[PDB]
């Protein structure tokens, strides 16, 4: 784990043009970027704080575009859906983005 941040993990509901809570359950998650040193790969993993449901487990491929829409809501795409992180604070956002931006540099 190269970072941990507190955020409401969201996915975009294409049909209804709205963000919904990842995994179907509202509430905050603790969100990590994990580094597999043996393979030099990264993934985003997040667990609901209250009940530890895993709500996101997403690879970070080389070239991913990570969009800092606001100081506290960052987002990125994959073929299946758009992911969003609504951070609890500007500090959580910057810690996570810094790690993401570093991960993307070293891939």
């Amino acid at each position: 784990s190269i970072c941990q941040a507190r955020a409401a993990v969201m996915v975009y509901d294409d049909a209804n043009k709205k963000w919904v809570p990842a995994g179907g359950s509202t509430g905050f998650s603790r969100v990590h970027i994990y580094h597999h040193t043996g393979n030099n790969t990264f993934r985003v993993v997040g667990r609901k704080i209250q009940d530890h449901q895993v709500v996101i487990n997403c690879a970070i491929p080389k070239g991913l575009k990570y969009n800092q829409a606001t100081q506290t809501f960052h987002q990125w795409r994959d073929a299946r859906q758009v992911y969003g992180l609504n951070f609890g604070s500007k500090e959580d956002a910057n810690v996570f983005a810094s790690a993401m931006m570093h991960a993307l540099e070293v891939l």
């Binding site: 963000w19 829409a69 606001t70 809501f73 795409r77």
Partner: peptide
Amino acid sequence: XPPX
């Protein structure tokens, strides 16, 4: 990107 969709807005927040």
